[PDB]
Amino acid sequence: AINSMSLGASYDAQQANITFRVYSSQATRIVLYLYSAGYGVQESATYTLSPAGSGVWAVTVPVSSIKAAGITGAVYYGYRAWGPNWPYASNWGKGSQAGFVSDVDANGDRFNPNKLLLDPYAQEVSQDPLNPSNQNGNVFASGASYRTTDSGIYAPKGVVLVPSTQSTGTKPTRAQKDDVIYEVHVRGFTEQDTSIPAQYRGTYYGAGLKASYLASLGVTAVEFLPVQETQNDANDVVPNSDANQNYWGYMTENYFSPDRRYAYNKAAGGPTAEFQAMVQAFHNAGIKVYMDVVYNHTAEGGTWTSSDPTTATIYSWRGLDNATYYELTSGNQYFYDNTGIGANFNTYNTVAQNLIVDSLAYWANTMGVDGFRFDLASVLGNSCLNGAYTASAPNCPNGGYNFDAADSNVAINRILREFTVRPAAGGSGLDLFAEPWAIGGNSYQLGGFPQGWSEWNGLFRDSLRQAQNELGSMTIYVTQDANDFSGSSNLFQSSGRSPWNSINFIDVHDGMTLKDVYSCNGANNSQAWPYGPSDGGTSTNYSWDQGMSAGTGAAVDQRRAARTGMAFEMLSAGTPLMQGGDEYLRTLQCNNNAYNLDSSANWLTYSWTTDQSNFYTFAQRLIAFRKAHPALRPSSWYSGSQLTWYQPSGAVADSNYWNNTSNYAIAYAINGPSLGDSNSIYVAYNGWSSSVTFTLPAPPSGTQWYRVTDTCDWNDGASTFVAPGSETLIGGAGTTYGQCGQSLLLLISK
Ligand SMILES: [Ca+2]
Numbered sequence: 001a002i003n004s005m006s007l008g009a010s011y012d013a014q015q016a017n018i019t020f021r022v023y024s025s026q027a028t029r030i031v032l033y034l035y036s037a038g039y040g041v042q043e044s045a046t047y048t049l050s051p052a053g054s055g056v057w058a059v060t061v062p063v064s065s066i067k068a069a070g071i072t073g074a075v076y077y078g079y080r081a082w083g084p085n086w087p088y089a090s091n092w093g094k095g096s097q098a099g100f101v102s103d104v105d106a107n108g109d110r111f112n113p114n115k116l117l118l119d120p121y122a123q124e125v126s127q128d129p130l131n132p133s134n135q136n137g138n139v140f141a142s143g144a145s146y147r148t149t150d151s152g153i154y155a156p157k158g159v160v161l162v163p164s165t166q167s168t169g170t171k172p173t174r175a176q177k178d179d180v181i182y183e184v185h186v187r188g189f190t191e192q193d194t195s196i197p198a199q200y201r202g203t204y205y206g207a208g209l210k211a212s213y214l215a216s217l218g219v220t221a222v223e224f225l226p227v228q229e230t231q232n233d234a235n236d237v238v239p240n241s242d243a244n245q246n247y248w249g250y251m252t253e254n255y256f257s258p259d260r261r262y263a264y265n266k267a268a269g270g271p272t273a274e275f276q277a278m279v280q281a282f283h284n285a286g287i288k289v290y291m292d293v294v295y296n297h298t299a300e301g302g303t304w305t306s307s308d309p310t311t312a313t314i315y316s317w318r319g320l321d322n323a324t325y326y327e328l329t330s331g332n333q334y335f336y337d338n339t340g341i342g343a344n345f346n347t348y349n350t351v352a353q354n355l356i357v358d359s360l361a362y363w364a365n366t367m368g369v370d371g372f373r374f375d376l377a378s379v380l381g382n383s384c385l386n387g388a389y390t391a392s393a394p395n396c397p398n399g400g401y402n403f404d405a406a407d408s409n410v411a412i413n414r415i416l417r418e419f420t421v422r423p424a425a426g427g428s429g430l431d432l433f434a435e436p437w438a439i440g441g442n443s444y445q446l447g448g449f450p451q452g453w454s455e456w457n458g459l460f461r462d463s464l465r466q467a468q469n470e471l472g473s474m475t476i477y478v479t480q481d482a483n484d485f486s487g488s489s490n491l492f493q494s495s496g497r498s499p500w501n502s503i504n505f506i507d508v509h510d511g512m513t514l515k516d517v518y519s520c521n522g523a524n525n526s527q528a529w530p531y532g533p534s535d536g537g538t539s540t541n542y543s544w545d546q547g548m549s550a551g552t553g554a555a556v557d558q559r560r561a562a563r564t565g566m567a568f569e570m571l572s573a574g575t576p577l578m579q580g581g582d583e584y585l586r587t588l589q590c591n592n593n594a595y596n597l598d599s600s601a602n603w604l605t606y607s608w609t610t611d612q613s614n615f616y617t618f619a620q621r622l623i624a625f626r627k628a629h630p631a632l633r634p635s636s637w638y639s640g641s642q643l644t645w646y647q648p649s650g651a652v653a654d655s656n657y658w659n660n661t662s663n664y665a666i667a668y669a670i671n672g673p674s675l676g677d678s679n680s681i682y683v684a685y686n687g688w689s690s691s692v693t694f695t696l697p698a699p700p701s702g703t704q705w706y707r708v709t710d711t712c713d714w715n716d717g718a719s720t721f722v723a724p725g726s727e728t729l730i731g732g733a734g735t736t737y738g739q740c741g742q743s744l745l746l747l748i749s750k
Contacts, residue, residue: 572632
């Protein structure tokens with residue numbers, strides 16, 4: 001169930017009382033601290049909580065008592081907990097060591113009463129651990145040097161919210177197969193956009209104002225990088241330096257709270273009502289709002305070092321019940337990790353898992369979000385509970401990490417039974433997307449997720465980048481191109497899934513932008529502000545500048561390649577995903593891991609050159625085309641009568657062709673009418689470095705072929721992709737077409 005324990009802080013109907021409920025299976029004592037401000041002040045009152053059974057502790061406070069304590073505005077709160085490793089000593093006082101036994105005990109408890117704790121169910125956070133007033137993270141650490149430090153006035157406080165009456169509009173019921181996703185950072189979306197009033201730039205409010213921009217481009221779903229509270233308030237303390245910045249936000253501090261830094265209205269309840277108003281603006285434009293969520297690790301991380309089990313950050317989950325929330329190593333002194341951040345969130349533990357479900361429900365229901373893309377999703381399929389084996393995790397015999405999509409108790413299956421996934425034909429429900437990998441063990445699971453889950457297709461990205469940029473360096477399989485274009489049945493069909501479950505993309509936030517994969521011979525992450533430096537992303541970008549540096553290529557060529565890559569994702573069966581900015585050839589000058597760049601090089605710009613504006617026209621018409629032709633969006637795997645593979649000779653691609661590893665050109669035709677389309681279409685990819693002549697087959701429907709686009713250099717301009725009705729008559733069966741090397745041809749029959 002959802003909200004099985006009714007955790008959190010909430011007012012009763014008449015706002016006469018607030019009830020605080022919090023879980024801890026090991027705590028010995030839990031005490032509520034109330035503050036009038038989130039930072040810099042001591043508490044106005046404290047209330048000892050009482051065991052309400054099943055590990056939940058509760059207390060109900062009358063509002064009059066709160067006002068009597070001096071708190072007449074918003075109620076900021078936190079907890080102080082005691083446990084086996086640090087029991088309550090009657091002489092303990094803030095900043096005292098009284099009662100201390102150990103920083104961590106044999107069972108993994110890490111209680112420290114000197115650390116004020118943020119409720120995991122807080123719906124809003126006052127400020128991040130590091131902010132403009134304090135950038136010393138040591139006040140939150142355990143260990144001999146810092147355990148007695150009282151973090152009270154520096155620690156983040158939760159805000160008790162009065163239910164918002166803000167509408168989130170009506171949720172689109174469009175089938176996922178008909179969507180075109182646009183990934184963008186909520187702050188970089190409008191931060192330097194002069195078409196938005198300055199005060200709204202880089203905020204939720206500002207993003208809502210760009211709904212029309214997205215509608216003209218033609219995308220149907222915006223996917224935001226993490227919006228749940230992340231460490232970002234100290235980003236601008238030191239100017240012209242990415243040193244202490246966290247831009248992307250893959251360090252969640254709280255799972256129910258919209259990040260305050262991204263809101264225009266920063267008052268208590270402001271980020272919340274503003275995020276709701278923002279999705280209303282999108283929902284009004286008929287656009288879905290997806291959220292990138294990260295439940296594989298927490299911002300608290302693990303131990304500071306792998307040799308000292310005593311020092312770790314404590315401000316939320318860890319202080320309340322470390323053994324419940326994190327996956328500990330055998331012996332419980334350290335953390336088990338498959339994320340590389342320091343510690344796995346214990347996704348297999350019921351209470352930890354309930355938090356994932358409960359926060360997802362909050363965002364989907366109260367916040368109006370239409371779907372979620374799960375970062376390092378394989379950690380949510382872990383059937384282990386600890387570094388060592390435990391009978392409670394029967395399916396994880398070796399302990400540690402073990403992905404098991406058949407275990408009904410892993411987080412990815414729990415989600416499926418608590419929520420309704422949108423049907424293939426549309427209707428209400430959620431759209432769930434997984435990045436099917438993590439770090440180590442059997443975590444790489446592309447094609448391993450259950451029905452109900454779509455996945456980020458890394459093989460689509462890589463194989464096509466290779467086909468365009470690695471000719472001669474590595475083997476390119478013409479059969480893989482085919483798989484890519486047809487919805488990767490090789491990955492999705494055996495599980496009973498469909499082509500639209502393949503999220504096809506050439507580029508995402510991780511790695512290079514579209515322009516960059518065709519303009520960079522490698523990553524360049526060591527530039528100075530505002531382009532770097534950034535500590536390395538992948539070593540395998542499969543990028544190439546099209547001969548630019550060698551003198552065998554030029555700018556048109558990089559644009560020809562970018563046109564070809566975008567066409568691959570927009571023409572292929574599956575659900576296309578483009579990175580915001582790719583519509584104007586956004587570049588990061590080859591930085592392929594810009595996660596710490598909260599700068600102008602990273603935000604989007606809307607002042608474009610002719611060549612950039614020309615690309616936007618290409619992108620806009622290509623997205624419009626996909627949306628106008630159902631034959632490109634099959635709900636099920638193309639049947640044999642619906643799609644025919646052709647060799648350049650106009651002859652059907654046979655086994656001799658498929659098994660010949662020196663064949664780089666491929667073409668196909670789809671029977672438009674059989675898929676409910678008005679035209680049949682023919683796509684040709686010349687993966688060869690030189691000109692290839694394609695002999696057109698007989699149109700499945702209609703009598704003649706008309707050219708829609710040719711990505712080749714000669715066709716570079718404002719009209720490389722024609723407007724509907726201006727297709728150039730090429731010819732019928734037998735007509736030939738000379739296709740330049742490394743490019744794509746699009747044709748419709750009439
Ligand atoms: Ca923040």
